[PDB]
Amino acid sequence: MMNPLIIKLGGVLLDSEEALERLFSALVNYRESHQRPLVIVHGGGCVVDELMKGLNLPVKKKNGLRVTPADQIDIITGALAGTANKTLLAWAKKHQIAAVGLFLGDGDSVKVTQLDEELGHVGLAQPGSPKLINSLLENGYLPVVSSIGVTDEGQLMNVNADQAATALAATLGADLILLSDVSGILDGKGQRIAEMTAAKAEQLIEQGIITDGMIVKVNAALDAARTLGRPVDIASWRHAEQLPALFNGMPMGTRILA
Amino acid sequence: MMNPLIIKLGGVLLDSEEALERLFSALVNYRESHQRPLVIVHGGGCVVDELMKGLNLPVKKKNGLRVTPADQIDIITGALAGTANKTLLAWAKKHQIAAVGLFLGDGDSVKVTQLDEELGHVGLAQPGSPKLINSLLENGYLPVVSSIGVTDEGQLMNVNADQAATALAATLGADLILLSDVSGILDGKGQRIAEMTAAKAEQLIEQGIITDGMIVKVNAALDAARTLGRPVDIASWRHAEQLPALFNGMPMGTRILA
Ligand SMILES: CC(=O)N[C@@H](CCC(=O)OP(=O)(O)O)C(=O)O
Numbered sequence: 001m002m003n004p005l006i007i008k009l010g011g012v013l014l015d016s017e018e019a020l021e022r023l024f025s026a027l028v029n030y031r032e033s034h035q036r037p038l039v040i041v042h043g044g045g046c047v048v049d050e051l052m053k054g055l056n057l058p059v060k061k062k063n064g065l066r067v068t069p070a071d072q073i074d075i076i077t078g079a080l081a082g083t084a085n086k087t088l089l090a091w092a093k094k095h096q097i098a099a100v101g102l103f104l105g106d107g108d109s110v111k112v113t114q115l116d117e118e119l120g121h122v123g124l125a126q127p128g129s130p131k132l133i134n135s136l137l138e139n140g141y142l143p144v145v146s147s148i149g150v151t152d153e154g155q156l157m158n159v160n161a162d163q164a165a166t167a168l169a170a171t172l173g174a175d176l177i178l179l180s181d182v183s184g185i186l187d188g189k190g191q192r193i194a195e196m197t198a199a200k201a202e203q204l205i206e207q208g209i210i211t212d213g214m215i216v217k218v219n220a221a222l223d224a225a226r227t228l229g230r231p232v233d234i235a236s237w238r239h240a241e242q243l244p245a246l247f248n249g250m251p252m253g254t255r256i257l258a
Numbered sequence: 259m260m261n262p263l264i265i266k267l268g269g270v271l272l273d274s275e276e277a278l279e280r281l282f283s284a285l286v287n288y289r290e291s292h293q294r295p296l297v298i299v300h301g302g303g304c305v306v307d308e309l310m311k312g313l314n315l316p317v318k319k320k321n322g323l324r325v326t327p328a329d330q331i332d333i334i335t336g337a338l339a340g341t342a343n344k345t346l347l348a349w350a351k352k353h354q355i356a357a358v359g360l361f362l363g364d365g366d367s368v369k370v371t372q373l374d375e376e377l378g379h380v381g382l383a384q385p386g387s388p389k390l391i392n393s394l395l396e397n398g399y400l401p402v403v404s405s406i407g408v409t410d411e412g413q414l415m416n417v418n419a420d421q422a423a424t425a426l427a428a429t430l431g432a433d434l435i436l437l438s439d440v441s442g443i444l445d446g447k448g449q450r451i452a453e454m455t456a457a458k459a460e461q462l463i464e465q466g467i468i469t470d471g472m473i474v475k476v477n478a479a480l481d482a483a484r485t486l487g488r489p490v491d492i493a494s495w496r497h498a499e500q501l502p503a504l505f506n507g508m509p510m511g512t513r514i515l516a
């Protein structure tokens with residue numbers, strides 16, 4: 001047996017039926033040979049933005065962060081905790097996987113407080129109780145956890161999915177992979193770097209090699225690893241066939257140590 | 259041995275803060291004095307219609323059931339499996355109740371097939387597997403179950419919540435209360451008929467004693483009672499003082515006998 005693995009799924013992946021079919025095929029392949037408890041954590045992003053578009057609701061920001069007013073946390077919760085979550089559960093059912101949909105508040109898995117009065121219903125994640133998810137994992141279910149949470153007072157909160165996944169990893173003593181569009185960082189010679197310290201990450205950045213949104217992806221993993229105290233992997237679905245090895249603990253993307 | 263009680267919620271209740279507060283206070287009151295575990299099944303009431311209005315989409319209802327187009331099932335799933343479900347989980351949290359949100363597909367609790375190609379993604383509920391919910395109940399959680407399901411082929415389905423709750427009642431061997439905005443059915447002497455057979459209910463419909471919106475509500479309870487072979491209670495959430503007595507087996511609304 002092994003400690004659990006949290007696979008966090010980013011926006012672009014959820015928007016792509018190709019990526020989803022490759023992911024769930026990968027999950028089936030891995031599960032045929034491997035025993036490790038797996039947990040999925042997901043955001044939404046696109047499905048939320050699509051729905052705000054359709055409702056002609058403006059998506060505002062304060063200092064580079066989203067704002068979820070009282071009067072739209074319910075819509076956002078619908079898109080994320082409902083649509084995105086159940087879409088994943090439908091994929092699981094199609095592929096014969098016994099999944100169970102959760103949000104952060106189920107079993108107080110991840111505790112959430114209000115980040116900032118000015119941002120409204122945006123939550124800050126912290127580790128919660130592992131009891132519920134441990135018992136689901138013990139009984140052979142694959143928990144699929146959305147990044148909506150709830151405060152102890154009963155207020156719904158939209159939580160950054162990377163930070164939610166980090167909190168849940170801490171809660172369960174789990175390893176963490178952040179799956180998205182980046183398959184792995186390459187050095188100044190176009191060679192995948194299998195393992196990267198904070199120091200080489202910081203060098204590689206404004207040495208000019210790590211640029212654009214990749215800065216944000218690497219910084220997200222560094223933040224997660226800094227918190228967790230064990231490494232966090234960045235990977236993509238690109239090489240479907242390597243995902244099972246990735247899930248088994250091999251650094252097939254880029255492993256961040258911080 | 260367990261004999262769980264399913265309380266089905268829907269309609270304008272889901273939108274009434276004061277009514278929800280009183281309902282959850284009654285749930286707590288029942289739980290403090292009883293070991294027998296509770297389950298909630300819910301529909302999407304005003305939450306779905308409100309989103310449809312804001313999107314300016316046609317609310318097409320053929321007979322009892324919302325025609326659910328392929329291009330609307332995601333949106334409806336969000337409102338029902340997301341917003342409605344997580345609202346109730348937030349109330350549960352406020353009242354210190356350990357609740358777990360589910361939909362019909364989790365643990366294959368209620369199985370769903372497409373009811374009619376013409377209705378689009380409308381599902382027909384049938385009894386499924388009690389394993390997941392029984393384990394949750396044995397471990398002290400309150401399952402809160404939305405009426406969205408999924409076919410074996412991975413297609414999301416919108417299911418009538420009364421029928422979904424009845425299928426779950428069959429699956430768990432549970433008692434069933436259908437809570438909605440109902441009135442008392444009065445006999446020829448102006449007294450509420452607390453308990454009646456299906457035939458009696460049918461007679462009273464034929465003979466114009468049961469009228470207006472109650473015809474629909476009695477027909478739902480009648481079909482449920484026949485399906486289950488146990489009595490099914492109809493009662494109003496507006497009289498929250500009577501709810502614990504109702505949960506304790508008192509026929510405070512209209513009980514349709516097997
Ligand atoms: C607070 C906040 O901004 N929440 C995000 C949750 C989705 C997300 O984080 O998208 P990823 O799947 O790419 O991580 C949102 O509102 O869209």
Ligand SMILES: CC(=O)N[C@@H](CCC(=O)OP(=O)(O)O)C(=O)O
Pocket residue numbers: 267268269300301302303304306322323324326380381405416417418419420
């Ligand atoms: C297929 C179908 O008709 N689904 C229902 C689900 C909700 C429901 O049954 O309404 P309640 O709130 O009164 O429980 C609907 O979309 O209206």
